Amino acid sequence: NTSNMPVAAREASIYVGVTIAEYFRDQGFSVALMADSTSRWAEALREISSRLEEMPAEEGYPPYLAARLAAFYERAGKVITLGGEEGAVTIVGAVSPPGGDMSEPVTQSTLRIVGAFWRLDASLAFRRHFPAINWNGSYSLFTSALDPWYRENVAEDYPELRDAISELLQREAGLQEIVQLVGPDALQDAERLVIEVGRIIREDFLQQNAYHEVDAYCSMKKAYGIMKMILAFYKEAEAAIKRGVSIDEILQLPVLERIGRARYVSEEEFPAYFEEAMKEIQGAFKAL
Amino acid sequence: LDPWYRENVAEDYPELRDAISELLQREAGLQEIVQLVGPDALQDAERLVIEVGRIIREDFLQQNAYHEVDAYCSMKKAYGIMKMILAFYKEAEAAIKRGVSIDEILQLPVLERIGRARYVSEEEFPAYFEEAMKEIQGAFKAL
Amino acid sequence: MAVIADPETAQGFRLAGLEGYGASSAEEAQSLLETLVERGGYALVAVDEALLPDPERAVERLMRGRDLPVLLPIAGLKEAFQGHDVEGYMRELVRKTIGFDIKL
Amino acid sequence: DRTHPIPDLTGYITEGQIQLSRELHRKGIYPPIDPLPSLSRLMNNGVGKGKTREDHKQVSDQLYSAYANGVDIRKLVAIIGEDALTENDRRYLQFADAFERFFINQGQQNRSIEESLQIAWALLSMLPQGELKRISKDHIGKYY
Amino acid sequence: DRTHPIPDLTGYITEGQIQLSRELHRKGIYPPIDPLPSLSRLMNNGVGKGKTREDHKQVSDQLYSAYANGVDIRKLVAIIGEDALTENDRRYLQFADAFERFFINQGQQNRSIEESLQIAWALLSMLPQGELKRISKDHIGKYY
Amino acid sequence: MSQVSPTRMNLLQRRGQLRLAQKGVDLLKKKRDALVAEFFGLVREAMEARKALDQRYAEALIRVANTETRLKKIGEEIKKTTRRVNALEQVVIPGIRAQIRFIQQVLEQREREDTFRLKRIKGKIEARE
Ligand SMILES: Nc1ncnc2c1ncn2[C@@H]1O[C@H](COP(=O)(O)OP(=O)(O)O)[C@@H](O)[C@H]1O
């Protein structure tokens, strides 16, 4: 969908694609429909509408857009094709507001339809945290829908682990807001530990390197194993603090640097870090 | 409206309400500071102002719409209650200036009567002024 | 810890086993602080307040440092106790805090 | 955005509002009800003797007050440390967890108002009886 | 809002502006004139020898400067505390109160320019003579 | 910018000063804790010190200030450059939330009202056409 092409063609492009997508799912294939983007499709449509003298509304967009855009996304889904067999069309649509405003067209109407939103965050990117997906502003509507697949095929504690990590990240967010006011000097050891582990979650888990030959893809089996290394370090961290272990002693714990490079390991040598973590804390229970 | 009150109810209506409002104004400022440095450093003079400020709020500002009597407070009753409160104030500040413990004034017997004055439907209320003065004298006696 | 006091008292702290050093003026005493500070081993120096009427300026002068002895003025002379330098230390400490020269 | 014209104009049409908050949901508190933005804009018209039970308003007031204090104390714990909290404040801190664990959380389950008041009184026992400022003595003797 | 287009466009049409402030009125200072936002666009054309008095511009300049410094010091007092203010700053702090109590406040009363300059010199005495940067020595000797 | 600045702005502001307030009451509690270990220190001090004056009897002396000196040691200066600490601190801190609060509301002033002279101008172009 180039600029020299009529607004008409770009408008029809998502419909031509979705139809081709539905065609392949009919065979019993799972197809992905990636739409660069609908902001530009709504601008091409607004050009056609204004030329037809249809009444402009908000940002001069025609009234008809919301029902249409919704109708598009409704054609997505996993079905039982004609003559049995299952196939599906998953849609990933790009959102490009006129400029950060994140209102109309694109964003506003889209975020109301779609069930999932992965918010690339320019500040997360500048900070070199990849993928640059904001774990606080992104959302999905399927956690409970897919938890049993993970529990049965990958790990029995998938849901409990992600809920626990999210509560960690949630707590960090609240703590950082307060610190923004009263500074970090008054922070108790318990709160410093939560920030320490919260930071490890962000750097060792949330951040992924798309450019690394290994971390470019993280198999399900590897995802849970890294999660349990982090969550196990958390429990041990809170347990050590409760026994008056200096947080400074935990912060420079040797295993931490290994946990930081775990995303780069392509072998289960990663779950070995759990035992390496426990003994190391014991060496910290020894020195007291 | 001050002249209507001065001519028909009481010559000191405006001066009395200005004085009560200055009391309430001072209380507001004091409470802001206490919110910071606590109430332990408070001088007797400042504790007296809070004591009388509180009596104004509880005995005057607050009115019971559900009580058969206090549901309506006639003009004549409003000024008489004001003068009992303002007279207790002057006497309070006068007693403190003569080293009377504020704790002694805070538990002064007339205070409980001043607190139920809004419930009295008879001028027995202005009698509280003389009852206040003699009681302070009994506090000037004991020193 | 060292103690800096008038010579008679300083002598008495010594007989009790403590490390008392004798001085008779604000300046003499600051000198004593500086020798102790340079000499190095003390974590705390308790000084008769008559001999340390300005302990912030006192720190100020000792320097350069390097990790300092806590410096603790403790009350004197003889007639300075037979006041109560408590009532007014308290007037200052509450004003100090809340801001309010309260009528005590 | 609760100030968007749609949700904002809807408030006037209600007798009770239950406001859910993403922040609360992200802390794992479900149901994710904002206890300081949910109102019986008309609650008092549907409670008490002959409707629910005579102690309903008092219990609701006390739970709301104790939960709000408990939530603020979570901030104070972060400021000073858990061990520096007073014994009385520790009880309010703990009450906030009890309110969330037992009253807010339901294992999907149809609680009668009698069941809900019972849980409310059970958690209230965690607080000193001398600290139940919003429950008249008549209700403490009859229901505590 | 003094930046609203109406009041903002009116400023150019004036030779003297007297700006009143709610904040000042709430401190009980009347008339509630902002001494650092009231100007004489044409003031210099109506003052001096043969009009008011030769020291009028110098006195006006010094009072304006001292009042502006005194008002900023009210902010500094809030930041550091009253006791941490220098002796010199304390004088400017006090001058701002004196300016408000005695110069701004009039008990309704028709002050001649001679009366107004006299009050001005009386309050100026609160400041160190060495701190009167905007009054030439000729005027200090003759009028102080 | 525009919208979004809108609400995180002032809850940095509002939620973030609700808890600066709350460190304020915290420290006047410390106020009352600190000042009461303040005078008593004071007490024995004044105390057998001059028990030292009229002065074996060597300890009516260091016995004296082993008690005397220790007590007011902890209390006397540990007890407050750290007391006068606690509270001298957290208040230039409700200074943060304070004038800096003026900050968020000239900020917020500036545009849910400015952003509006505007949703409405553009209406106005072919709203008027
Ligand atoms: N250089 C200056 N020195 C002293 N006062 C000045 C000066 N410039 C402006 N002012 C004050 O501001 C008033 C308005 O200034 P002016 O230049 O006319 O405003 P504008 O920016 O609207 O053109 C002047 O009459 C005077 O009182």
Short mmCIF file of all heavy atoms in Angstrom, two decimals, chain B residues 58-104, unseen atoms left out:
data_model
loop_
_atom_site.label_atom_id
_atom_site.label_comp_id
_atom_site.label_asym_id
_atom_site.label_seq_id
_atom_site.Cartn_x
_atom_site.Cartn_y
_atom_site.Cartn_z
N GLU B 58 -19.06 23.71 68.75
CA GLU B 58 -19.97 22.71 69.34
C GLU B 58 -21.24 23.32 69.94
O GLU B 58 -22.33 22.77 69.78
CB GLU B 58 -19.26 21.92 70.42
N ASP B 59 -21.11 24.51 70.51
CA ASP B 59 -22.21 25.15 71.26
C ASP B 59 -22.98 26.16 70.41
O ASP B 59 -24.09 26.56 70.79
CB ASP B 59 -21.70 25.82 72.55
N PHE B 60 -22.36 26.63 69.34
CA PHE B 60 -22.98 27.65 68.48
C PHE B 60 -23.19 27.18 67.04
O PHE B 60 -24.32 27.11 66.56
CB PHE B 60 -22.17 28.94 68.57
N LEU B 61 -22.10 26.91 66.33
CA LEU B 61 -22.18 26.53 64.90
C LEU B 61 -23.08 25.31 64.68
O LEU B 61 -24.00 25.34 63.87
CB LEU B 61 -20.79 26.25 64.33
N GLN B 62 -22.83 24.29 65.48
CA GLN B 62 -23.65 23.08 65.45
C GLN B 62 -25.04 23.35 66.02
O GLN B 62 -25.19 23.97 67.08
CB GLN B 62 -22.97 21.99 66.26
N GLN B 63 -26.03 22.95 65.25
CA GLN B 63 -27.45 23.07 65.61
C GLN B 63 -28.16 21.77 65.23
O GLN B 63 -27.91 21.20 64.17
CB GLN B 63 -28.03 24.24 64.84
N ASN B 64 -29.05 21.34 66.10
CA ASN B 64 -29.77 20.07 65.93
C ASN B 64 -31.14 20.34 65.30
O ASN B 64 -32.08 20.76 65.98
CB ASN B 64 -29.89 19.38 67.29
N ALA B 65 -31.22 20.03 64.01
CA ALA B 65 -32.46 20.17 63.23
C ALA B 65 -33.58 19.22 63.69
O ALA B 65 -34.75 19.44 63.40
CB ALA B 65 -32.15 19.93 61.75
N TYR B 66 -33.18 18.15 64.37
CA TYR B 66 -34.11 17.12 64.88
C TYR B 66 -34.67 17.40 66.28
O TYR B 66 -35.58 16.70 66.73
CB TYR B 66 -33.41 15.75 64.84
N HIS B 67 -34.09 18.34 67.00
CA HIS B 67 -34.54 18.68 68.36
C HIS B 67 -35.72 19.64 68.22
O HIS B 67 -35.64 20.62 67.50
CB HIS B 67 -33.40 19.32 69.15
N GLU B 68 -36.73 19.41 69.05
CA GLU B 68 -37.94 20.25 69.03
C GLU B 68 -37.67 21.73 69.33
O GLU B 68 -38.46 22.60 68.97
CB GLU B 68 -39.00 19.71 70.00
N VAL B 69 -36.56 21.99 70.03
CA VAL B 69 -36.19 23.36 70.43
C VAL B 69 -35.13 23.94 69.48
O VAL B 69 -35.35 25.00 68.89
CB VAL B 69 -35.68 23.39 71.89
N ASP B 70 -34.01 23.25 69.37
CA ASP B 70 -32.87 23.75 68.60
C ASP B 70 -33.09 23.70 67.08
O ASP B 70 -32.21 24.08 66.32
CB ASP B 70 -31.61 22.98 68.99
N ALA B 71 -34.24 23.17 66.67
CA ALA B 71 -34.63 23.13 65.25
C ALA B 71 -34.75 24.55 64.67
O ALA B 71 -34.62 24.73 63.46
CB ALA B 71 -35.97 22.41 65.08
N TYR B 72 -35.10 25.49 65.54
CA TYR B 72 -35.18 26.92 65.20
C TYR B 72 -34.60 27.73 66.37
O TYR B 72 -34.97 27.52 67.53
CB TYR B 72 -36.65 27.28 64.97
N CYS B 73 -33.75 28.69 66.03
CA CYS B 73 -33.11 29.55 67.04
C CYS B 73 -33.44 31.01 66.75
O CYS B 73 -32.88 31.64 65.84
CB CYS B 73 -31.60 29.31 67.06
N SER B 74 -34.38 31.53 67.53
CA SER B 74 -34.85 32.92 67.40
C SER B 74 -33.66 33.89 67.51
O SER B 74 -32.73 33.66 68.29
CB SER B 74 -35.87 33.26 68.49
N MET B 75 -33.77 35.01 66.82
CA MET B 75 -32.74 36.07 66.84
C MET B 75 -32.29 36.46 68.24
O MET B 75 -31.09 36.46 68.53
CB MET B 75 -33.28 37.34 66.18
N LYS B 76 -33.28 36.59 69.11
CA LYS B 76 -33.02 36.96 70.52
C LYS B 76 -32.16 35.90 71.23
O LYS B 76 -31.27 36.25 72.02
CB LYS B 76 -34.35 37.13 71.24
N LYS B 77 -32.39 34.64 70.91
CA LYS B 77 -31.64 33.52 71.49
C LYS B 77 -30.22 33.42 70.91
O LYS B 77 -29.27 33.14 71.64
CB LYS B 77 -32.40 32.21 71.28
N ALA B 78 -30.07 33.76 69.63
CA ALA B 78 -28.79 33.68 68.92
C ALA B 78 -27.73 34.63 69.53
O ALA B 78 -26.59 34.27 69.78
CB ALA B 78 -28.98 34.04 67.44
N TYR B 79 -28.13 35.87 69.79
CA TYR B 79 -27.21 36.85 70.37
C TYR B 79 -26.87 36.54 71.84
O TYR B 79 -25.73 36.70 72.26
CB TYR B 79 -27.84 38.23 70.26
N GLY B 80 -27.87 36.03 72.56
CA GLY B 80 -27.71 35.70 73.99
C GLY B 80 -26.71 34.55 74.16
O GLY B 80 -25.80 34.60 74.97
N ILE B 81 -26.79 33.58 73.28
CA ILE B 81 -25.83 32.46 73.28
C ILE B 81 -24.42 32.93 72.86
O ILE B 81 -23.38 32.45 73.30
CB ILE B 81 -26.32 31.31 72.41
N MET B 82 -24.40 33.91 71.98
CA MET B 82 -23.14 34.48 71.49
C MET B 82 -22.43 35.25 72.61
O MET B 82 -21.22 35.21 72.80
CB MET B 82 -23.47 35.40 70.32
N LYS B 83 -23.22 35.96 73.38
CA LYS B 83 -22.62 36.75 74.45
C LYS B 83 -22.13 35.85 75.60
O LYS B 83 -21.12 36.15 76.20
CB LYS B 83 -23.68 37.72 74.87
N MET B 84 -22.76 34.68 75.78
CA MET B 84 -22.32 33.71 76.81
C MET B 84 -20.98 33.10 76.45
O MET B 84 -20.11 32.95 77.30
CB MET B 84 -23.29 32.55 77.12
N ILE B 85 -20.82 32.89 75.15
CA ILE B 85 -19.59 32.29 74.61
C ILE B 85 -18.44 33.31 74.61
O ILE B 85 -17.38 33.06 75.16
CB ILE B 85 -19.81 31.67 73.22
N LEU B 86 -18.75 34.52 74.13
CA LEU B 86 -17.77 35.61 74.06
C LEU B 86 -17.34 36.12 75.42
O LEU B 86 -16.18 36.48 75.62
CB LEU B 86 -18.28 36.76 73.20
N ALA B 87 -18.27 36.03 76.37
CA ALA B 87 -18.01 36.43 77.76
C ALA B 87 -17.13 35.38 78.46
O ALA B 87 -16.24 35.73 79.23
CB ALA B 87 -19.31 36.59 78.55
N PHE B 88 -17.34 34.12 78.08
CA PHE B 88 -16.52 33.00 78.59
C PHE B 88 -15.10 33.11 78.03
O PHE B 88 -14.14 32.80 78.72
CB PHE B 88 -17.15 31.68 78.16
N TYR B 89 -15.00 33.63 76.81
CA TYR B 89 -13.71 33.85 76.13
C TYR B 89 -12.88 34.91 76.86
O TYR B 89 -11.75 34.65 77.26
CB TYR B 89 -13.96 34.27 74.68
N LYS B 90 -13.50 36.07 77.06
CA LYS B 90 -12.85 37.20 77.75
C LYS B 90 -12.36 36.79 79.14
O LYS B 90 -11.17 36.91 79.45
CB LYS B 90 -13.84 38.35 77.90
N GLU B 91 -13.25 36.10 79.87
CA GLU B 91 -12.94 35.58 81.20
C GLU B 91 -11.84 34.52 81.19
O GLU B 91 -10.97 34.50 82.06
CB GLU B 91 -14.21 34.97 81.82
N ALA B 92 -11.82 33.74 80.12
CA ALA B 92 -10.83 32.67 79.93
C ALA B 92 -9.43 33.28 79.74
O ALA B 92 -8.48 32.91 80.42
CB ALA B 92 -11.28 31.85 78.74
N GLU B 93 -9.35 34.25 78.83
CA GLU B 93 -8.10 34.97 78.51
C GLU B 93 -7.61 35.81 79.68
O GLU B 93 -6.42 35.91 79.91
CB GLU B 93 -8.30 35.85 77.28
N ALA B 94 -8.57 36.30 80.46
CA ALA B 94 -8.30 37.12 81.65
C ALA B 94 -7.75 36.27 82.79
O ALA B 94 -6.79 36.65 83.45
CB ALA B 94 -9.58 37.83 82.10
N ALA B 95 -8.28 35.06 82.92
CA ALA B 95 -7.86 34.10 83.96
C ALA B 95 -6.46 33.57 83.66
O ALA B 95 -5.59 33.59 84.53
CB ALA B 95 -8.84 32.94 84.00
N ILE B 96 -6.22 33.22 82.40
CA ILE B 96 -4.88 32.79 81.95
C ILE B 96 -3.83 33.88 82.21
O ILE B 96 -2.73 33.56 82.64
CB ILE B 96 -4.87 32.36 80.47
N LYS B 97 -4.19 35.11 81.88
CA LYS B 97 -3.27 36.25 82.08
C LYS B 97 -2.89 36.40 83.56
O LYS B 97 -1.85 36.97 83.88
CB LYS B 97 -3.88 37.55 81.57
N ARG B 98 -3.70 35.80 84.43
CA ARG B 98 -3.46 35.83 85.88
C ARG B 98 -3.00 34.47 86.42
O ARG B 98 -3.11 34.17 87.61
CB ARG B 98 -4.73 36.31 86.60
N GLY B 99 -2.44 33.67 85.50
CA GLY B 99 -1.80 32.37 85.80
C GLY B 99 -2.76 31.28 86.28
O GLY B 99 -2.33 30.31 86.90
N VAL B 100 -4.03 31.38 85.90
CA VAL B 100 -5.01 30.31 86.17
C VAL B 100 -4.72 29.19 85.17
O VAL B 100 -4.69 29.42 83.96
CB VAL B 100 -6.46 30.82 86.04
N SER B 101 -4.62 27.97 85.69
CA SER B 101 -4.37 26.80 84.83
C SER B 101 -5.55 26.65 83.88
O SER B 101 -6.72 26.67 84.28
CB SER B 101 -4.21 25.52 85.66
N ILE B 102 -5.23 26.42 82.62
CA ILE B 102 -6.27 26.21 81.60
C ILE B 102 -7.10 24.95 81.90
O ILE B 102 -8.30 24.91 81.65
CB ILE B 102 -5.64 26.13 80.20
N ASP B 103 -6.42 23.97 82.48
CA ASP B 103 -7.05 22.70 82.91
C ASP B 103 -8.16 22.97 83.93
O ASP B 103 -9.20 22.33 83.89
CB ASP B 103 -6.00 21.78 83.53
N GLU B 104 -7.95 24.02 84.73
CA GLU B 104 -8.93 24.46 85.73
C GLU B 104 -10.17 25.08 85.07
O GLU B 104 -11.29 24.88 85.52
CB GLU B 104 -8.28 25.46 86.68
#
